[PDB]
Each structure stands twice: as structure tokens, then as C-alpha cells.
Amino acid sequence: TDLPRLPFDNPDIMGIAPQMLALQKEGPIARVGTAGEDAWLVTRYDEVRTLLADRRLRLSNPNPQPSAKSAARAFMVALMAGDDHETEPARHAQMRSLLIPRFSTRRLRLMKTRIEHHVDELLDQLAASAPPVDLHRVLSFRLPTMVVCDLLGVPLADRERFGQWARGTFDQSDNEHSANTFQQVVDYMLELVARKRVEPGDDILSELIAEKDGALSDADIAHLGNAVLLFGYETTIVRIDLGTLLLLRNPVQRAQLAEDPGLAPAAVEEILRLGVGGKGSNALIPRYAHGDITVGETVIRTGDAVMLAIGAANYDDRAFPDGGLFDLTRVRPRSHLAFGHGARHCIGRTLARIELTAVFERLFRRLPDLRLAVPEESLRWQEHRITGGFDEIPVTF
Ligand code: HEM
Ligand SMILES: CC1=C[C@@]23[C@H](C=C(C(=O)O)[C@@H]2COC(=O)[C@]32CO2)[C@@H]1C
């Protein structure tokens, strides 16, 4: 008897840690240690999906003495309206109600055209440069930050100011750095809201200023813009880096994609499903039980912490036959859980798919000989950041 302790070791730079797979074959739910409180870890797809849709399972902590968390996690939960369990129902409903209409078909179609031109321009630059080139810096980071600038209605150069603020806000290793970084986001957002009040445009804060005939406080609006800035680019960057690495590992599928860019949507769903980095700590959705729940034969009691392993679930043979294999031809793939599910289902997920699709429509058709310029083993997943990610992807082509 040995209590498994998160995070588990991963000898590979991607995938699911061996011990996590071992637990998943044993059963759907396991008691594990973590950096703080012990938690139920749910590993199989069926149970993860069902509990993500169970409203007794909430982001907010209902416990009388909530355990102290990193500043990073505290900011993340606060941005998701999860910091006060008594107000979370009304606050979270308002948050989704105000943000979902910002991702309208009209905005997404215009965004798609611009995204497509931007990738073409990014790849022409990449192709004109001399190897070795950091693909992370000149492609992965640049497209999603471009998109956030357009969402917020600010010049592209602004991403040179804010492009590391998600990383800094979500650094679990340094509470002081986390708070200084978030203070910069807050300052920047408030200045931006004040300007959109007198110089609006076709962007999301202008629409929020106009919403509820302006009943929303500037702080309400800046809060929603902080969620857009801080969630709107970093994960997409990481998925671009991860998707490149997966397609380099699977040359048969990659060549198919280069030949037929109509396979890009399929590739993108496989990228999202299999794209798990390092120890995959960001592929765990955290929740607390607000009521008793029976899972398998395990009783989750009110107040317990629950780790919902969407990465492990996405690899689950029960849902995806040979779940570890990259396959563009998965007939009618069970919807992966990489955007979550249920009440907090990712709000930017159509935008992210549009971005990823534009990228992988073009990348290996524009640079078919693109390959890693360093061994895979030299790529370092940043475990201390809630959002993880690699810091550089050296490539030749
Ligand atoms: C490939 C890129 C992305 C991935 C893998 C991803 C993943 C996720 C996941 C798993 C959740 C659920 C978290 C939970 O249930 O606790 C979530 C929530 C969220 N995401 Fe995405 N996301 C991505 C891109 C984006 C983009 C581009 C935006 C906005 C521009 C965005 C905005 C949000 C917001 C606001 C939430 C909170 C939803 C809520 O709590 O109600 N994300 N994301
Ligand atoms: C607001 C979010 C938190 C994430 C979710 C995806 C993430 C990621 O891919 O890094 C984050 C990591 O931390 C979490 O708790 C998540 C998984 O729930 C999403 C962007």
C-alpha cells in the first residue's frame, strides 16, 4: 500500500504518466496525495465526463477553513468567479452570459479570415529565415497573441507588453511574482476600459461597455477582459507547440495532412485529444464536492477535492480505441474532453479551433521539411506554470 502522489513522473515529454495509466486500468477513481490536500482522482472518460456535468461538483471550495493555495491558482479561480462559493452561482452565470455572445458567428467569421492571412504572413517570414529558428517564438506565440489584440481592439505591438503575463500570473512557484504580474494586467485592463468608454470599436470591451445599457461597473468589465487576456492565448500557444510535436512524431499522418489540408479539422481534434505535456498537471480540472456523490463504489463526500483527469480520459481505450495512437481517420471520434464539459465548458473553444485549424492547414504544406533542430529530450515542459508549456521549439526546415 503506497498512496500515489501527484504529480506523477513522465519519462516522455508528452503523453500520460505511467502511474496515471496504471490507476486508470485499475478503476475509474483513486485517492491520491497532491502538493496540498489529498484528492479523488478520476481517470476514465465516462466518469470524468459525467462528473464534469454534475452540478454537485463545483470550482468553488465550500469548506469552512479553505486551504491556502498559490497566488497563481487564487487568481485563476478568482477570474473564473470561483473564489466565493456563496456568490459563484449568480456570478458565474453572469460571466458566461456576458462572454458567450462576444464569440458570435459574425465575429468568428471575420476573425477566421484575418487569422488565415496572418498565418500565411507568419510562415512566409519563417520560410525566409535561416535555421535554426525558434518556432515557438515566431509562430506558436505570435498567432494567438495577435488574436487577443483583435478581441480587445489594441495594436498588435501591445502583445509585446502582455505576452508573458499569463505565464507570470500563473507561476505557482513565486507568489510575489504572480501578484506583481497580475497587478500589471489589472492596470493595463483598467486603462483600456477607460479608453474604450470614449473611443469604442469593434471589439469585446466596447460591446461590454454597451451591455446592460452600461450597468456593468468598469471593474466588472475589466474582470471579464482579464479573463480574455489571461485565458485567451497561452493555452492556444501550447496547443500549437504540442500539435507540431505530435505531427513530427507521426509522419504518415503528417504527409496525409500536407497533401490534403481538408484533414486539418480532424488533425486538430487529434492534437487536442493527445496534446498533453510533461507531467500533465494542466490536464487536471479541479473541483470540490458541494454534495455527496457516488462514483463507482467510491463515496465522494461534501467538501472533498476532486481531480478530473481530462488528459487521462482523452487517452482512455474505453472511449478511443488505441487511445495513445494519433489517427486522422478516427470514425466519429467521441468528443474529447480537452475543452472541458458541463457548466464551465470552454467559451473560446471555437476560436481556438479556428486558430489551430488555420495553422495546421498550412504549416507542413508551406514547410514540408520542417523538423526539430534539437532532440526531443532537450525540450523542457514548465511544470511550475499552471498552463505548463514549452519555452522554445528549435526547428530547421
Ligand atoms: C486550445 C486552447 C484552449 C484550451 C485547451 C482550453 C481549455 C479550457 C478548459 C479545459 C476549460 C474548463 C476549465 C474548468 O472546467 O475548470 C476552459 C475554460 C475557459 N476557457 Fe478555454 N481553452 C482554450 C482556449 C481558450 C480561448 C482562445 C479562450 C478565450 C478567448 C478561452 C476562454 C476560456 C474561459 C473564459 C473559460 C472559463 C469557462 C468557465 O469557467 O465558465 N479558452 N478552457
Ligand atoms: C481557465 C483554465 C484552466 C485550465 C483550463 C485549461 C488549462 C490548460 O490547458 O493549461 C488551464 C490549466 O489549469 C486548469 O485548472 C485548467 C484545466 O482546467 C482553462 C484554460
Swiss-Prot record:
One of its GO terms (biological process) is antibiotic biosynthetic process. Pfam families: p450 (PF00067). Its EC number is 1.14.19.8. Pathway: Antibiotic biosynthesis; pentalenolactone biosynthesis. Keywords: Antibiotic biosynthesis, Heme, Iron, Metal-binding, Monooxygenase, Oxidoreductase. The keyword Iron applies. Heme binds at C346. It is an enzyme of class 1 (oxidoreductase). Disruption phenotype: Accumulation of the precursor pentalenolactone F and lack of production of pentalenolactone. Belongs to the cytochrome P450 family. This is Pentalenolactone synthase. It comes from Streptomyces arenae. The lineage of its organism: Bacteria, Bacillati, Actinomycetota, Actinomycetes, Kitasatosporales.
